[PDB]
Each structure stands twice: as C-alpha cells, then as structure tokens.
mmCIF file of C-alpha atoms in Angstrom:
data_model
loop_
_atom_site.group_PDB
_atom_site.id
_atom_site.type_symbol
_atom_site.label_atom_id
_atom_site.label_comp_id
_atom_site.label_asym_id
_atom_site.label_seq_id
_atom_site.Cartn_x
_atom_site.Cartn_y
_atom_site.Cartn_z
ATOM 1 C CA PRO A 1 -9.432 9.840 10.701
ATOM 2 C CA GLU A 2 -7.562 8.260 13.614
ATOM 3 C CA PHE A 3 -5.656 5.170 12.475
ATOM 4 C CA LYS A 4 -7.405 3.237 15.265
ATOM 5 C CA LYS A 5 -10.756 3.854 13.582
ATOM 6 C CA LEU A 6 -9.482 2.365 10.300
ATOM 7 C CA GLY A 7 -10.166 -1.296 11.011
ATOM 8 C CA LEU A 8 -6.582 -2.111 10.047
ATOM 9 C CA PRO A 9 -4.245 -3.877 12.493
ATOM 10 C CA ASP A 10 -1.364 -2.331 14.421
ATOM 11 C CA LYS A 11 1.495 -3.787 12.382
ATOM 12 C CA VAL A 12 0.554 -1.547 9.413
ATOM 13 C CA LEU A 13 1.378 1.530 11.479
ATOM 14 C CA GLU A 14 4.752 0.035 12.446
ATOM 15 C CA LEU A 15 5.591 0.529 8.800
ATOM 16 C CA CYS A 16 5.664 4.240 9.413
ATOM 17 C CA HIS A 17 8.652 3.654 11.699
ATOM 18 C CA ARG A 18 10.642 2.308 8.766
ATOM 19 C CA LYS A 19 13.460 4.667 7.678
ATOM 20 C CA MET A 20 13.320 3.992 3.895
ATOM 21 C CA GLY A 21 11.614 1.813 1.331
ATOM 22 C CA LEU A 22 8.250 1.571 -0.350
ATOM 23 C CA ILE A 23 4.759 1.381 1.155
ATOM 24 C CA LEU A 24 1.843 0.869 -1.267
ATOM 25 C CA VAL A 25 -1.861 1.257 -0.551
ATOM 26 C CA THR A 26 -4.170 0.059 -3.303
ATOM 27 C CA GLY A 27 -7.714 -0.624 -4.450
ATOM 28 C CA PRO A 28 -10.441 0.339 -6.897
ATOM 29 C CA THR A 29 -12.293 3.609 -7.230
ATOM 30 C CA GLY A 30 -13.488 4.961 -3.881
ATOM 31 C CA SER A 31 -11.627 2.190 -1.985
ATOM 32 C CA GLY A 32 -10.682 4.566 0.817
ATOM 33 C CA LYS A 33 -6.987 4.281 0.017
ATOM 34 C CA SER A 34 -6.239 7.998 0.280
ATOM 35 C CA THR A 35 -7.908 7.961 3.721
ATOM 36 C CA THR A 36 -5.595 5.166 4.891
ATOM 37 C CA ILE A 37 -2.532 6.933 3.533
ATOM 38 C CA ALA A 38 -3.592 10.167 5.161
ATOM 39 C CA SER A 39 -4.227 8.550 8.532
ATOM 40 C CA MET A 40 -0.776 6.892 8.413
ATOM 41 C CA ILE A 41 1.056 10.056 7.380
ATOM 42 C CA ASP A 42 -0.813 12.080 9.977
ATOM 43 C CA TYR A 43 0.493 9.584 12.570
ATOM 44 C CA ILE A 44 3.955 10.480 11.413
ATOM 45 C CA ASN A 45 3.036 14.178 11.635
ATOM 46 C CA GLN A 46 2.028 13.757 15.262
ATOM 47 C CA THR A 47 4.828 11.473 16.366
ATOM 48 C CA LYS A 48 8.007 12.486 14.577
ATOM 49 C CA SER A 49 9.664 15.740 13.606
ATOM 50 C CA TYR A 50 10.280 14.887 9.930
ATOM 51 C CA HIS A 51 10.214 16.796 6.654
ATOM 52 C CA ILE A 52 7.251 15.370 4.717
ATOM 53 C CA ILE A 53 6.593 16.064 1.059
ATOM 54 C CA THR A 54 3.324 15.206 -0.684
ATOM 55 C CA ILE A 55 2.419 15.136 -4.395
ATOM 56 C CA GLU A 56 -1.366 14.710 -4.983
ATOM 57 C CA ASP A 57 -3.513 15.303 -8.048
ATOM 58 C CA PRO A 58 -6.037 17.137 -5.930
ATOM 59 C CA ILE A 59 -4.932 17.090 -2.315
ATOM 60 C CA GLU A 60 -7.556 15.003 -0.656
ATOM 61 C CA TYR A 61 -6.914 15.879 2.981
ATOM 62 C CA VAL A 62 -5.049 18.828 4.445
ATOM 63 C CA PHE A 63 -2.527 18.131 7.132
ATOM 64 C CA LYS A 64 -2.432 20.041 10.438
ATOM 65 C CA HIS A 65 0.952 21.416 11.462
ATOM 66 C CA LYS A 66 1.895 19.132 14.363
ATOM 67 C CA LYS A 67 5.389 17.712 15.041
ATOM 68 C CA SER A 68 6.477 17.330 11.394
ATOM 69 C CA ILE A 69 7.030 19.717 8.467
ATOM 70 C CA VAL A 70 4.609 18.854 5.654
ATOM 71 C CA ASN A 71 4.699 20.294 2.186
ATOM 72 C CA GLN A 72 1.656 19.305 0.102
ATOM 73 C CA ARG A 73 1.965 19.871 -3.626
ATOM 74 C CA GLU A 74 -0.943 19.677 -6.061
ATOM 75 C CA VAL A 75 0.162 18.616 -9.523
ATOM 76 C CA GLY A 76 -1.166 21.555 -11.499
ATOM 77 C CA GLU A 77 -1.323 24.797 -9.541
ATOM 78 C CA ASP A 78 1.890 24.058 -7.691
ATOM 79 C CA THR A 79 3.579 22.015 -10.447
ATOM 80 C CA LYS A 80 2.637 19.847 -13.459
ATOM 81 C CA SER A 81 3.808 16.220 -13.757
ATOM 82 C CA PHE A 82 4.222 13.690 -10.950
ATOM 83 C CA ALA A 83 7.604 12.812 -12.410
ATOM 84 C CA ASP A 84 8.791 16.419 -12.480
ATOM 85 C CA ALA A 85 7.669 17.159 -8.926
ATOM 86 C CA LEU A 86 8.934 13.858 -7.686
ATOM 87 C CA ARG A 87 12.518 14.423 -8.760
ATOM 88 C CA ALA A 88 12.248 17.922 -7.228
ATOM 89 C CA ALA A 89 11.197 16.639 -3.808
ATOM 90 C CA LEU A 90 13.940 14.052 -4.119
ATOM 91 C CA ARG A 91 16.867 16.459 -4.127
ATOM 92 C CA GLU A 92 15.094 18.364 -1.322
ATOM 93 C CA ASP A 93 15.972 15.314 0.827
ATOM 94 C CA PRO A 94 12.855 14.760 2.914
ATOM 95 C CA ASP A 95 12.215 11.911 5.355
ATOM 96 C CA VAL A 96 9.002 10.914 3.666
ATOM 97 C CA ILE A 97 7.484 11.456 0.236
ATOM 98 C CA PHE A 98 3.947 10.536 -0.830
ATOM 99 C CA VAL A 99 3.433 10.068 -4.599
ATOM 100 C CA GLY A 100 -0.280 10.173 -5.288
ATOM 101 C CA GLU A 101 -0.193 7.972 -8.358
ATOM 102 C CA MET A 102 2.238 6.020 -10.506
ATOM 103 C CA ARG A 103 0.555 5.852 -13.910
ATOM 104 C CA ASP A 104 3.932 6.148 -15.544
ATOM 105 C CA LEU A 105 7.265 4.499 -15.980
ATOM 106 C CA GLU A 106 9.069 7.718 -15.126
ATOM 107 C CA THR A 107 7.186 8.205 -11.839
ATOM 108 C CA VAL A 108 7.573 4.608 -10.838
ATOM 109 C CA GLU A 109 11.293 4.581 -11.625
ATOM 110 C CA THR A 110 11.813 7.713 -9.617
ATOM 111 C CA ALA A 111 9.796 6.279 -6.742
ATOM 112 C CA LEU A 112 12.045 3.192 -6.665
ATOM 113 C CA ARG A 113 15.210 5.222 -6.514
ATOM 114 C CA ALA A 114 13.860 7.428 -3.739
ATOM 115 C CA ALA A 115 12.935 4.313 -1.765
ATOM 116 C CA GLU A 116 16.444 2.875 -2.146
ATOM 117 C CA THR A 117 18.525 5.974 -1.283
ATOM 118 C CA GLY A 118 17.201 6.649 2.221
ATOM 119 C CA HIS A 119 13.601 7.736 1.889
ATOM 120 C CA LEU A 120 10.271 6.336 3.015
ATOM 121 C CA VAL A 121 7.953 6.301 0.019
ATOM 122 C CA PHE A 122 4.146 6.017 0.045
ATOM 123 C CA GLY A 123 2.327 5.464 -3.224
ATOM 124 C CA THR A 124 -1.086 4.388 -4.436
ATOM 125 C CA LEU A 125 -2.236 2.199 -7.292
ATOM 126 C CA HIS A 126 -5.686 1.031 -8.427
ATOM 127 C CA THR A 127 -4.788 -2.667 -8.356
ATOM 128 C CA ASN A 128 -7.037 -4.935 -6.342
ATOM 129 C CA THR A 129 -4.595 -7.440 -4.818
ATOM 130 C CA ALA A 130 -1.115 -7.610 -3.303
ATOM 131 C CA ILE A 131 -0.142 -9.876 -6.181
ATOM 132 C CA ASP A 132 -1.566 -7.741 -8.985
ATOM 133 C CA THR A 133 0.233 -4.842 -7.366
ATOM 134 C CA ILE A 134 3.587 -6.477 -7.902
ATOM 135 C CA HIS A 135 2.791 -7.345 -11.494
ATOM 136 C CA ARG A 136 1.661 -3.829 -12.357
ATOM 137 C CA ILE A 137 4.802 -2.366 -10.863
ATOM 138 C CA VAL A 138 7.126 -4.756 -12.679
ATOM 139 C CA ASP A 139 5.231 -5.206 -15.952
ATOM 140 C CA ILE A 140 5.106 -1.546 -16.726
ATOM 141 C CA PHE A 141 8.860 -1.861 -17.377
ATOM 142 C CA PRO A 142 10.517 -3.166 -20.551
ATOM 143 C CA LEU A 143 11.047 -6.929 -20.523
ATOM 144 C CA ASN A 144 14.836 -6.557 -20.257
ATOM 145 C CA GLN A 145 14.361 -4.466 -17.122
ATOM 146 C CA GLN A 146 11.843 -6.525 -15.157
ATOM 147 C CA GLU A 147 14.255 -8.950 -13.475
ATOM 148 C CA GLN A 148 15.925 -5.756 -12.246
ATOM 149 C CA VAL A 149 12.726 -4.159 -10.890
ATOM 150 C CA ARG A 150 11.562 -7.426 -9.414
ATOM 151 C CA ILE A 151 14.667 -7.833 -7.223
ATOM 152 C CA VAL A 152 14.798 -4.126 -6.218
ATOM 153 C CA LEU A 153 11.279 -4.561 -4.881
ATOM 154 C CA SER A 154 12.369 -7.670 -3.024
ATOM 155 C CA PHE A 155 14.795 -5.530 -0.999
ATOM 156 C CA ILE A 156 12.970 -2.222 -0.707
ATOM 157 C CA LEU A 157 9.252 -3.176 -0.522
ATOM 158 C CA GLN A 158 8.029 -2.510 3.028
ATOM 159 C CA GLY A 159 4.370 -3.317 2.810
ATOM 160 C CA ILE A 160 1.393 -3.288 0.530
ATOM 161 C CA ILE A 161 -2.215 -2.840 1.664
ATOM 162 C CA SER A 162 -5.078 -3.734 -0.724
ATOM 163 C CA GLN A 163 -8.327 -2.134 0.563
ATOM 164 C CA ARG A 164 -12.046 -2.307 -0.059
ATOM 165 C CA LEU A 165 -14.861 -0.587 1.834
ATOM 166 C CA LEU A 166 -17.964 -2.768 2.383
ATOM 167 C CA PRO A 167 -21.446 -1.787 3.588
ATOM 168 C CA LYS A 168 -23.136 -2.991 6.794
ATOM 169 C CA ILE A 169 -23.283 -2.493 10.549
ATOM 170 C CA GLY A 170 -20.886 -2.157 13.495
ATOM 171 C CA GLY A 171 -19.642 1.364 12.742
ATOM 172 C CA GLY A 172 -20.940 2.034 9.216
ATOM 173 C CA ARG A 173 -18.961 0.678 6.283
ATOM 174 C CA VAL A 174 -16.231 -1.808 6.983
ATOM 175 C CA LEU A 175 -12.704 -1.934 5.606
ATOM 176 C CA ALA A 176 -11.789 -5.198 3.890
ATOM 177 C CA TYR A 177 -8.051 -5.476 3.215
ATOM 178 C CA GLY A 178 -5.302 -7.763 1.983
ATOM 179 C CA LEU A 179 -1.847 -7.250 3.546
ATOM 180 C CA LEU A 180 1.670 -8.289 2.540
ATOM 181 C CA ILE A 181 4.555 -7.169 4.716
ATOM 182 C CA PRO A 182 7.456 -9.157 3.370
ATOM 183 C CA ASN A 183 9.605 -11.201 5.740
ATOM 184 C CA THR A 184 12.813 -13.006 4.750
ATOM 185 C CA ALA A 185 10.903 -15.869 3.078
ATOM 186 C CA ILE A 186 8.610 -13.789 0.819
ATOM 187 C CA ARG A 187 11.556 -11.473 0.016
ATOM 188 C CA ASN A 188 13.345 -14.505 -1.345
ATOM 189 C CA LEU A 189 10.323 -15.760 -3.263
ATOM 190 C CA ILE A 190 9.839 -12.339 -4.867
ATOM 191 C CA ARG A 191 13.494 -12.613 -5.890
ATOM 192 C CA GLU A 192 13.003 -16.029 -7.537
ATOM 193 C CA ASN A 193 9.625 -14.873 -8.892
ATOM 194 C CA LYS A 194 7.541 -17.392 -6.927
ATOM 195 C CA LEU A 195 4.506 -15.138 -6.591
ATOM 196 C CA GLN A 196 2.261 -18.191 -6.466
ATOM 197 C CA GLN A 197 4.100 -19.391 -3.356
ATOM 198 C CA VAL A 198 4.068 -15.837 -1.921
ATOM 199 C CA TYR A 199 0.266 -16.069 -1.932
ATOM 200 C CA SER A 200 0.238 -19.466 -0.235
ATOM 201 C CA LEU A 201 2.428 -17.902 2.426
ATOM 202 C CA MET A 202 -0.092 -15.110 2.890
ATOM 203 C CA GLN A 203 -2.739 -17.714 3.666
ATOM 204 C CA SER A 204 -0.626 -18.902 6.619
ATOM 205 C CA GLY A 205 -0.318 -15.573 8.423
ATOM 206 C CA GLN A 206 -3.273 -16.542 10.635
ATOM 207 C CA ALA A 207 -5.227 -13.555 11.950
ATOM 208 C CA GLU A 208 -2.443 -11.250 10.694
ATOM 209 C CA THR A 209 1.133 -12.308 11.602
ATOM 210 C CA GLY A 210 2.449 -9.915 8.955
ATOM 211 C CA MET A 211 0.309 -11.254 6.114
ATOM 212 C CA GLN A 212 -3.364 -11.636 5.344
ATOM 213 C CA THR A 213 -5.274 -12.303 2.151
ATOM 214 C CA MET A 214 -8.426 -10.322 1.253
ATOM 215 C CA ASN A 215 -10.475 -13.539 1.110
ATOM 216 C CA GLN A 216 -9.505 -14.229 4.691
ATOM 217 C CA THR A 217 -10.417 -10.727 5.835
ATOM 218 C CA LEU A 218 -13.822 -11.085 4.156
ATOM 219 C CA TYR A 219 -14.216 -14.449 5.795
ATOM 220 C CA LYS A 220 -13.594 -13.069 9.296
ATOM 221 C CA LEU A 221 -15.757 -9.985 8.718
ATOM 222 C CA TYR A 222 -18.546 -12.288 7.555
ATOM 223 C CA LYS A 223 -17.956 -14.694 10.441
ATOM 224 C CA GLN A 224 -18.420 -11.773 12.827
ATOM 225 C CA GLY A 225 -21.704 -10.800 11.166
ATOM 226 C CA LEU A 226 -20.023 -7.638 10.018
ATOM 227 C CA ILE A 227 -20.957 -7.999 6.319
ATOM 228 C CA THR A 228 -23.415 -10.256 4.549
ATOM 229 C CA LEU A 229 -22.493 -13.389 2.594
ATOM 230 C CA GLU A 230 -23.516 -11.738 -0.684
ATOM 231 C CA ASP A 231 -21.398 -8.663 0.002
ATOM 232 C CA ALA A 232 -18.369 -10.841 0.722
ATOM 233 C CA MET A 233 -18.685 -12.931 -2.416
ATOM 234 C CA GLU A 234 -19.215 -9.711 -4.379
ATOM 235 C CA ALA A 235 -15.869 -8.208 -3.269
ATOM 236 C CA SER A 236 -13.640 -11.308 -3.234
ATOM 237 C CA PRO A 237 -10.848 -11.318 -5.834
ATOM 238 C CA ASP A 238 -11.486 -15.056 -5.990
ATOM 239 C CA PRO A 239 -14.960 -16.155 -4.949
ATOM 240 C CA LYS A 240 -14.116 -19.849 -5.424
ATOM 241 C CA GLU A 241 -11.550 -19.748 -2.619
ATOM 242 C CA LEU A 242 -13.984 -17.975 -0.246
ATOM 243 C CA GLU A 243 -16.739 -20.425 -1.004
ATOM 244 C CA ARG A 244 -14.314 -23.251 -0.324
ATOM 245 C CA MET A 245 -13.516 -21.497 2.909
ATOM 246 C CA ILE A 246 -17.114 -21.103 4.079
ATOM 247 C CA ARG A 247 -17.887 -24.836 3.802
#
C-alpha cells in the first residue's frame, strides 16, 4: 500500500530520510504494523538507491526491485535466529535493516548497536503505547544495564508509531495511531527518565507537530464521524482520559 493511503501524517515518512537510528512500529495482533513498515520501506525502495536487508519470521510482503537493493531473509529457510541473522546483516553494512521482532535481549542489543554505528533500523514490538514501548525495550535488560539502554535510546531513537486499525466508514477500516518523534526536550526527559512528562509533552503536539497520543487520534477520528464512540472507548489505552476529553 501507498504510504498516502495509510492515514498517517507526512512527518512519519520523513523518518525514512534519517541516516541512522531506530524506528519502531508497534501494536497488538493484527494492528497493521507490518503494513506500515512495508509501505515505509517501499518508499525507500522507490526513492533511494540503498542496500536494504530484511529479517522476517514469515516475510509478509515481497518487495519489487525498484531503486534500492533489497534482501529479504526469512528466519528459518534462509537462516534460524533473529540474533544470528541480525549480526550477519550488520557486517554486510547495509543502509537499512528491518528486524521483524525483538523478543530477545540478544536481538534488541544487536539492534541498538546497529542503530548507533551508522544504520537505519526498523523494528516491531507488540506494545500498545509509545510509553510501554520504551519500558519493554529498557526493562528487558538487567537492572544494572537499564540506565545505559535508556540513554542510548535518548540519542538514537528516531520515532515510534503505535497503531490500531478500527472499523467504520470513509475508506474501510481506519488507522488509529500514537506517535512520538523525539525533539530536544523529550530526548532530555528520556535521559532523566521523566516518561510521565514525555507523555504530557505528547499531548501538546496539537494535530501532530511531531507528537500525538492515541487518545487524541481517537478523539479526532471520532470527531470526524470516522469511528463510533463505542469503538473509540474500546481501543483507548486510557478510556478515562478520552472521556474527559469528550466532555
């Protein structure tokens, strides 16, 4: 799918012009996150002549050979463990790597190093919120290593998209998303571990301006008659905040 059909705003695609660092796209089962990822990489494919390496449990979409060079590796027939395959792409030196899933410490740690030594890294997680995303990434590490991981993220995190697909009208289903594309202020707060204040700053990014909470995105979809009230409440990672909004 064309990134313009995604229902996501333009600044998410600017992320693909970043030269290194980590981009995360998350959400529950059948959240459409692979479809977002694939639309964003296929943009790259069409626009830049890069070397692109993919690592997917089953590959979920096959990429056309356009401007870029894309190697898509299924953990299993091609290789075996995400970790294994990741460190193998790493030495290969590509411009972009997509790591289908970081279930593991080893995968996650390799992803972080790739992102810091000159590569653009896409990954997916099943977390529901930009905030939970950060906690899953850090918390999987041993206590004594989390300050470390937290501040690496503060410098190398490029963006995280939390998605949900809702029913209704307009085009079919609609994409509901949360979005956190750190700026100097949230970088700092991640550093100090002020994740509560990071959220308050997402509430300020009006109709985007780099940041946008899920609850807001549900609110505007609802306010445009794009989903129903019940659907919105059902999908909110904090119904109390949306209900306060509605009033």
